[PDB]
Symmetry: C2
Subunit: 208 residues, 2 copies
């Protein structure tokens, strides 16, 4: 295959990978996975990603990769001229700290809104977990504001892989009952991101 | 390097990587892990710390030079960070996401099922064998080792997972694992 194929769903974390591919100036083929019919849970998609999640990335040799953070580092690795990962190990580690925080904590908090059935069986448990999301996401936003976002981007002046990842997650905040406006650095960050060519490109492709 | 860790937690995976890289470090017992650099920079998140260790000791070969294999390694690491450790965390840290005692009982009761499902995925789709990438050790391996160590306690019988069993046996034989055991890290 000449180009990368990205399996994605609008409004999901898969969009972070699309943003990175756009920043890398690489051609790619987006494939929409339709949550409205639970396409991600069906045999055809499970043959692509047995975990039943987006994103998944199909490489030129048909290898399938999964996990947003891994795909972001992959894009950087195949497009070094985009400068998406700092050469300084400390700065790159701060970039990855932000990414793993999003993967392990902030996305996970968001996931308890609609995917409570991953960890519980009772309806009352789902209602309990759903009710806590505005508070858990606000606490995550607090940490982003104080300990992740140097400003304007995660690493400060320099855009990096942490930024598309953070952007897509922070895009969930209003919908999760958290005012992004209450966080000045997050607000400035979202304004810079919204103005970038990569983000305009994915919007034009119907991803946001 | 100063590493803040707690025995029997995921922070130990970082110590294992530092041992593999043959870097000197001062373990400080206490989230962990946290890594204090000489300029007093504090770095956090296991997966980020693992890549940091490989970045400062490139001759250790802890990350494949092939970007595909490196992405497969990181896929395993993010899976552990986002799914398997998370599933485990609902056993005793359910209060992160719920308030009602009935929700905690529900969560507790699912842990053997969620952890077994993760073990199934590890066995079939992460662990090529003997290590994550096959014959070649990588950053994914210390991460997987510490997480798989929780399986028995979470109600999952590892004996029924032959690749996980082989993997744990190979890890136990490594100098890095013997070293963190010698330091009381577990
Ligand atoms: N740890 C995974 C999370 C992937 C994930 O959960 N994606 C969501 C959308 S944001 C999904 O596919 N949900 C489908 C479902 O749970 O059925 C990653 O970072 O790639
Ligand atoms: N996303 C973090 C998770 C760190 C974490 O949760 N560590 C646990 C031990 S495995 C902890 O420190 N828990 C403290 C607490 O819950 O009180 C990472 O992978 O580094
Ligand atoms: Cl700066």
């Amino acid at each position: 295959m000449v180009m990368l194929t990205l399996y994605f769903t609008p409004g999901t974390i898969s969009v972070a990978v699309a943003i990175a591919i756009e920043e890398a100036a690489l051609p790619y083929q987006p494939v929409r996975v339709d949550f409205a019919t639970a396409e991600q849970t069906k045999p055809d998609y499970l043959a692509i990603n047995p975990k039943g999640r987006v994103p998944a990335l199909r490489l030129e040799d048909d290898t399938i990769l999964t996990e947003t953070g891994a795909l972001l580092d992959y894009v950087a690795a195949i497009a070094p001229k985009a400068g998406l990962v700092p050469t300084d190990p400390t700065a790159a580690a701060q970039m990855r700290s932000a990414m793993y925080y999003l993967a392990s904590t902030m996305h996970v908090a968001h996931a308890h809104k609609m995917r409570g059935s991953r960890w519980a069986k009772q309806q009352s448990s789902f209602e309990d977990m759903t009710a806590q999301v505005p508070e858990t996401m606000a606490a995550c936003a607090d940490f982003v504001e104080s300990d992740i976002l140097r400003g304007p981007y995660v690493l400060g002046e320099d855009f990096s892989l942490a930024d598309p990842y953070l952007f897509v997650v922070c895009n969930w905040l209003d919908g999760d009952g958290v005012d992004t406006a209450a966080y000045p650095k997050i607000t400035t960050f979202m304004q810079q991101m919204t103005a970038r060519a990569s983000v305009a490109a994915v919007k034009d492709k119907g991803m946001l």
